[PDB]
Write an enzyme that holds these catalytic residues in place. Sequence first.
Site, PDB file in Angstrom:
ATOM      1  N   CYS A 144       3.918  36.588  13.321  1.00  0.00           N
ATOM      2  CA  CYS A 144       3.238  36.474  12.036  1.00  0.00           C
ATOM      3  C   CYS A 144       1.911  37.236  12.005  1.00  0.00           C
ATOM      4  O   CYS A 144       1.577  37.872  11.006  1.00  0.00           O
ATOM      5  CB  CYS A 144       3.018  35.000  11.683  1.00  0.00           C
ATOM      6  SG  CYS A 144       1.874  34.136  12.775  1.00  0.00           S
ATOM      7  N   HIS A 199      -0.377  30.146  12.387  1.00  0.00           N
ATOM      8  CA  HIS A 199       0.367  30.984  11.456  1.00  0.00           C
ATOM      9  C   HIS A 199      -0.569  31.654  10.457  1.00  0.00           C
ATOM     10  O   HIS A 199      -1.560  31.066  10.031  1.00  0.00           O
ATOM     11  CB  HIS A 199       1.411  30.153  10.715  1.00  0.00           C
ATOM     12  CG  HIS A 199       2.499  30.972  10.089  1.00  0.00           C
ATOM     13  ND1 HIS A 199       3.557  31.471  10.812  1.00  0.00           N
ATOM     14  CD2 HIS A 199       2.687  31.378   8.811  1.00  0.00           C
ATOM     15  CE1 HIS A 199       4.361  32.150  10.002  1.00  0.00           C
ATOM     16  NE2 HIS A 199       3.850  32.105   8.788  1.00  0.00           N
ATOM     17  N   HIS A 253       4.206  36.721   4.509  1.00  0.00           N
ATOM     18  CA  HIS A 253       4.157  36.345   5.915  1.00  0.00           C
ATOM     19  C   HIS A 253       5.527  36.458   6.559  1.00  0.00           C
ATOM     20  O   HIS A 253       6.548  36.450   5.877  1.00  0.00           O
ATOM     21  CB  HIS A 253       3.645  34.911   6.064  1.00  0.00           C
ATOM     22  CG  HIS A 253       4.569  33.874   5.496  1.00  0.00           C
ATOM     23  ND1 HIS A 253       4.930  32.748   6.192  1.00  0.00           N
ATOM     24  CD2 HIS A 253       5.191  33.796   4.295  1.00  0.00           C
ATOM     25  CE1 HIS A 253       5.745  32.011   5.447  1.00  0.00           C
ATOM     26  NE2 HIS A 253       5.915  32.632   4.293  1.00  0.00           N
TER      27      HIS A 253
END
Lengths: 175, 218
Positions: free
Chosen positions: A84, A133, A145
């Site tokens: 990510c 994240h 993302h």
Amino acid sequence: ATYTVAPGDTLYSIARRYGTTVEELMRLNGLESFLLQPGQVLKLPPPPPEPEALDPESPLLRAVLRYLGVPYKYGANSPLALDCSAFVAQVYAELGVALPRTTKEQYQAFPPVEAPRPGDLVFFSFGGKEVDHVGIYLGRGVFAHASSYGSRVVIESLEAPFYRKVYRGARRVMA
Amino acid sequence: ATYTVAPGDTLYSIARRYGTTVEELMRLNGLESFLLQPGQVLKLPSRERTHVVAPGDTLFSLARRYGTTVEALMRLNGLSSPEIKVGQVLRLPEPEALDPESPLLRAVLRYLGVPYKYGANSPLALDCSAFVAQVYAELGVALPRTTKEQYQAFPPVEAPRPGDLVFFSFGGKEVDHVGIYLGRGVFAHASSYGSRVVIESLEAPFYRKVYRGARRVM
């Protein structure tokens, strides 16, 4: 009383401008289809502010769109928490902005922005433990993302219940 | 191996071409960032190739089989004479889709993040299909308003291609949700959370579960 359709107008934009709904606007005009040509006169039943939004030809969006639907795996068997933040760095690389590899560094290295604007990084805690994240805020409450599902790049809403919960703040990386 | 960076080239695009990962590509070259100047020269990973000498094989014959000389193949294996025995191990040297410039996708991207609420108190089953009808309105195709009508008034299709309407049953009772398949297994739709338009994966467990097929309106 009356509105004349300008190029680019939609039933959504017109309904929103005059504080009504697409339905009411279609009912009151006897419309059976969303088709709208310039010069068309619509009957109507203080313009609200416009949200900042990227352009379909913006360098930031175009970079995101290249990977849209494509899985972004950083290494051979790299975890999502690495994928990510590697996707975020890759996009910004196409814009001349160097970014740290890891989500953690990205979180700590940049100044906090309370209400994010198009271009800012948004951070989450999927596992709950730590910030793990990261995505790129696109404006209008959506962000891009690498997702849990195979690290495929997607665009989702920040105002979904899951994301509102796992949210951890935003950071600025450009001007 | 060696590659010189061209303008518009990325770690991902380079790693993909030479069959390797972005991670290794960075590690091997001591990169501190993803930033890549067009004057750069990146070291590519070299694959290890060995060959067990079979009957009939010679150093002259193996040289032309793999693309090298007998002299080169000799140094690499530390030999003085072109003699190889049967059983000896010799070292040897050495899909996408989406197009931002598209009528369908231009229209979809116009609504990213927008809470497409068709009415003052309208259900998601109505919102999602109004949105679909809205996008296609800018492509000169008049669609019905409701999900139920978009479902049963157009030819069903086995697999979806970009543009096709993808259907789901979030409820279980009936088909009550629709999106626009864009390609790469992602679709645009008004999301359950706030009728916001998002672009999600068709391949996520939930959507693969409540999937109800695809239809063609174009």
